Amino acid sequence: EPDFYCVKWIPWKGEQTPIITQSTNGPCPLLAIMNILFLQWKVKLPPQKEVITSDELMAHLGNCLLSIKPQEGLQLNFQQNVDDAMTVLPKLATGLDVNVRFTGVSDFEYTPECSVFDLLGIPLYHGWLVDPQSPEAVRAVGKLSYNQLVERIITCKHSSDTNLVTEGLIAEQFLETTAAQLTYHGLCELTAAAKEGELSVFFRNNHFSTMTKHKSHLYLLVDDQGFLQEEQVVWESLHNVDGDSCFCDSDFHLSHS
């Protein structure tokens, strides 16, 4: 029934902290969330441990969510947020559709999976922002979600009115041209947004990655099983829109294979 993953043991806050690794590059965000908790020393693993099941990671997470004492804001809601988190807890192992909005980097269509993040105080961000410098598209896309833009693009193909068939393409364009779901305007907004040395989760091309700002740059944790052995390789810059990027030790210093 369950999947296995290997554990990179790295020195974090000068203490031998575990992290979870995956070559598969799967869409499920269990590892993205979990890695954060491990870093935050909320979940501790026996030094010796080499491998971990989903069923373990899950149970560790369950305990964590149920262990959250409230702290005032949503009060009836908090209890529903827990029950919501708890009910969609299994869907985390599997994989998760994500309807992004293009309206800003913390903007998604709510699914009850969002409740897990909200509870653990983990921000979720995406890179796919429409550029106000293309007001043609800004207007065409408007305050609309991704899976919604597709519905409407299709609606617009078949529409008689050629005001729509024009916008139907004005949008078909914006997606044709932003295929890697991280526009420049995205990166800028996303960097500015994310708090200095705060652990967040970064969504893009149906993968979840663990994020932080550090000395006003964005780095992502190095989940790639590929560098299992390499204690020195932990953060990979998200400095460029696409291309090349420098690896670093847990202190955000350069490191080489």
Residue numbers in the entry: 110 to 181, 185 to 369
Sentences from the paper on this structure:
Despite this distance, we found a water molecule to coordinate T335 with H319 via hydrogen bonding, an unusual mechanism that may serve to orient H319 for catalysis, thereby adopting the function of the third catalytic residue. To test whether such an unusual catalytic architecture is possible, we introduced a T335V mutation to disrupt this water bridge, which resulted in a substantial loss of activity. As T335 serves a catalytic function to correctly position H319 for catalysis, we wondered if mutating T335 to a negatively charged residue would enhance the activity of MINDY1. To our surprise, the mutation of T335 to aspartate also abolishes MINDY1 activity. To understand the reason underlying this loss of activity, we determined the crystal structure of MINDY1T335D, which revealed the formation of an ionic interaction between T335D and the catalytic H319. H319 is locked in this conformation, which is further rigidified by the network of hydrogen bonds with Q131, S321, and N134, resulting in the catalytic Cys being rotated away from H319. Hence, the mutation T335D also forces the enzyme into an unproductive catalytic state, thus highlighting the requirement of a water molecule to bridge an interaction with T335 via hydrogen bonding to correctly position H319.
MINDY1 and MINDY2 are members of the MINDY family of deubiquitinases (DUBs) that have exquisite specificity for cleaving K48-polyUb, yet we have a poor understanding of their catalytic mechanism. Here, we analyze the crystal structures of MINDY1 and MINDY2 alone and in complex with monoUb, di-, and penta-K48-polyUb, identifying 5 distinct Ub binding sites in the catalytic domain that explain how these DUBs sense both Ub chain length and linkage type to cleave K48-polyUb chains. The activity of MINDY1/2 is inhibited by the Cys-loop, and we find that substrate interaction relieves autoinhibition to activate these DUBs. We also find that MINDY1/2 use a non-canonical catalytic triad composed of Cys-His-Thr.
